[PDB]
UniProtKB/Swiss-Prot annotation:
This is Bromodomain-containing protein 1. Highly expressed in testis. The lineage of its organism: Eukaryota, Metazoa, Chordata, Craniata, Vertebrata. Component of some HBO1 complex composed of KAT7/HBO1, MEAF6, ING4 and BRD1/BRPF2. Component of the MOZ/MORF complex composed at least of ING5, KAT6A, KAT6B, MEAF6 and one of BRPF1, BRD1/BRPF2 and BRPF3. Interacts (via PHD-type zinc finger domain) with unmodified histone H3. Interacts (via PWWP domain) with dimethylated and trimethylated 'Lys-79' on histone H3. It is found in: Nucleus; Chromosome. Coiled coil: none annotated. There is a cross-link at residue 41 (Glycyl lysine isopeptide (Lys-Gly) (interchain with G-Cter in SUMO2)). It comes from Homo sapiens (Human).
Length: 123
């Protein structure tokens, strides 16, 4: 149907905007602490602690498969990256502190992303 195609165009445009958001958020992690999944070889007890691991590479895979239907779903995954880190790692670690900085700097980006999704009408 034309309606299916129109919905697909909307999803494709959302994916374009979220790719831009993702790039901006990842720039706020210059240490690349959140770039890849936590290694279960190197942290073998991780899944005893963290029930839903997340990282930027895993978000990018879902994104390129157009697997985010709205901004809320994308934000859920970003918040997992930060929240997982702030539970597993203590306050006096480079990891926890990187997550605080990513949260703080990323909030700015997400604030405007919300306005753009609403404005242009992408979901």
């Amino acid at each position: 149907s034309m309606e299916q195609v129109a919905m697909e165009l909307r999803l494709t445009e959302l994916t374009r905007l979220l790719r831009s958001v993702l790039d901006q958020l990842q720039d706020k992690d210059p240490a690349r602490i959140f770039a890849q999944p936590v290694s279960l070889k190197e942290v073998p007890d991780y899944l005893d602690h963290i029930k839903h691991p997340m990282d930027f590479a895993t978000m990018r895979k879902r994104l390129e498969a157009q697997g985010y239907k709205n901004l809320h779903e994308f934000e859920e995954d970003f918040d997992l990256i930060i929240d997982n880190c702030m539970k597993y790692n203590a306050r006096d670690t480079v990891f926890y502190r990187a997550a605080v900085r990513l949260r703080d700097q990323g909030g700015v980006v997400l604030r405007q992303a919300r306005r753009e999704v609403d404005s242009i009408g992408l979901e």
